[PDB]
């Protein structure tokens, strides 16, 4: 089971079937955020997917191959968060990203709040390319969420 697309990452270790995160299958590689799997192996039906690359500081992890997602926010246009919340169908949310300004540079940020298990849902540009993964962000004064557009 390796066709391109967005996938839910489920676990059976707690009560019932829990969704801990989301991932993107592209070019035979499965992309997600480190804190979702924390590097653990994943089942895809009969087959098993094993970690290939990971980086806790980037909060990213690849499976069955090197990271393949290289599209980047253009810093002007709006983008779409293909959010996949636990128990609910995929939903596209258009927005204009903000900016995380850091010592080492600026990264796009999306001010959309979703359940913890939404970690890893892809972010797309107008041409459909995945520009990053939603999940690694901060909490501001009001108390809601701003996620980076985490790209590998």
């Amino acid at each position: 089971e390796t066709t391109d697309g967005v996938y839910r990452v489920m676990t059976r270790r707690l009560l019932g079937s829990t969704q801990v995160g989301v991932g993107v299958m592209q070019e035979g590689v499965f992309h997600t955020m480190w804190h979702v799997t924390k590097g653990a192996a994943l089942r895809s039906g009969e087959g098993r997917l094993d970690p290939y690359w990971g980086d806790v500081k980037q909060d990213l992890v690849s499976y069955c191959g090197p990271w393949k997602l290289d599209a980047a926010w253009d810093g002007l246009s709006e983008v779409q968060l293909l959010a996949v919340p636990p128990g609910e169908r995929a939903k596209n949310i258009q927005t204009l990203p903000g900016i995380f300004k850091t010592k080492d540079g600026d990264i796009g940020a999306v001010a959309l709040d979703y359940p913890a298990g939404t970690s890893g849902s892809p972010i797309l540009d107008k041409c459909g390319r995945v520009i990053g993964l939603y999940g690694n962000g901060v909490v501001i004064k009001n108390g809601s969420y701003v996620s980076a557009i985490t790209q590998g």
Binding site: E1, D4, G5, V6, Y7, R8, V9, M10, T11, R12, R13, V20, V22, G23, M25, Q26, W34, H35, T37, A40, A41, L42, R43, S44, L49, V56, K57, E78, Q80, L82, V84, R89, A90, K91, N92, I93, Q94, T95, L96, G98, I99, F100, K101, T102, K103, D104, A109, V110, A111, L124, D125, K126, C127, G128, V130, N136, G137, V138, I140, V146
Partner: protein, 38 residues
């Protein structure tokens, strides 16, 4: 163990709900991959 199930294609939807603002924030990324407001 964990497992994955497919949830859809990666597509831009022309009739999508627009929302969310665009803040400019000063943040720091520590060695453990956690962002913090600065």
């Amino acid at each position: 163990d964990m497992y994955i199930e497919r949830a859809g294609d990666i597509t831009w939807e022309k009739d999508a709900e627009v929302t969310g603002n665009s803040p400019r924030l000063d943040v720091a990324l520590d060695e453990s991959g956690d962002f913090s407001l600065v």
